[PDB]
């Protein structure tokens with residue numbers, strides 16, 4: 605059974621072309637609408653299609669954002685089209701697994717994902733974040749379930765830009781965003797003048813989860829989230845609280861030292877990385893490019909590095925000027941001699 609529609613390509617000139625697909629199958633939903641998988645008739649390639657109710661009182665923000673983005677570690681918008689009350693259909697690349705699902709197979713077997721995979725996956729997530737943040741886009745929903753994963757190639761793609769937004773100095777933003785477990789403390793204190801650094805809090809939570817086998821901060825609610833954070837970081841400094849929201853009763857608790865938090869044969873360089881990501885003071889957190897340049901990811905800059913299945917690594921070093929624009933000298937670390 606073949607559906608043909610007139611769709612504009614995601615990146616190109618506004619040149620609507622007939623597109624045909626088959627094998628339609630519901631795989632998802634949300635308050636937005638429904639998500640399908642489909643096979644493109646021409647290439648045979650697989651696709652997800654996010655179908656979203658649109659009014660005419662607004663440009664869709666997810667769409668605006670997806671048309672600007674072009675990057676190996678971000679899911680690609682292939683086409684978009686309208687259908688029957690009118691819906692928007694985003695046609696995305698389909699990747700059958702996520703970090704969350706892969707990590708969960710490990711965890712259900714009381715096992716720990718090998719560190720090489722943790723390096724690969726985290727590195728590519730940091731790239732994707734350098735890319736979007738250079739446009740001033742904040743994802744606002746970094747979690748393992750939103751990291752697409754081809755486990756044979758170890759390629760990771762960031763997906764689900766339905767909370768993503770451009771942040772502008774002096775335009776306030778909603779404090780209750782991000783999935784709870786991955787939600788930065790400034791957000792829990794109700795900050796509305798936050799930066800892109802909330803995505804970096806989230807990323808360190810993903811890293812920490814991948815080293816622990818489970819979420820580091822499993823909060824009963826928006827507010828118990830803060831308590832869970834405090835058990836590990838301890839109560840924040842008066843200056844820390846001011847850096848989060850310059851404008852809540854909790855007892856006084858000391859920091860658990862970072863080395864006691866993770867399994868004992870955990871590499872120092874992961875702990876060191878983690879600790880510069882899960883900082884209270886938002887401006888103390890590493891930028892995504894600085895995090896890519898961290899020494900934890902040095903195995904990935906070795907010229908002989910190989911996936912455990914014997915294949916080569918995916919592309920790790922093909923940086924664009926866009927991608928490097930926040931700190932260009934980092935290229936000396938980032939692009940190693942052998943490229």
Ligand SMILES: COc1ccccc1-c1c2c(nc3[nH]nc(C)c13)CC(C)(C)CC2=O
Pocket residue numbers: 631632639652654679696697698699700701702749750751752763764
């Ligand atoms: C907007 O939809 C998504 C949002 C977040 C994560 C994945 C998807 C979607 C899904 C999957 N692969 C995907 N590849 N590409 C897309 C898109 C996508 C496989 C799952 C995890 C089993 C189901 C799913 O929803």
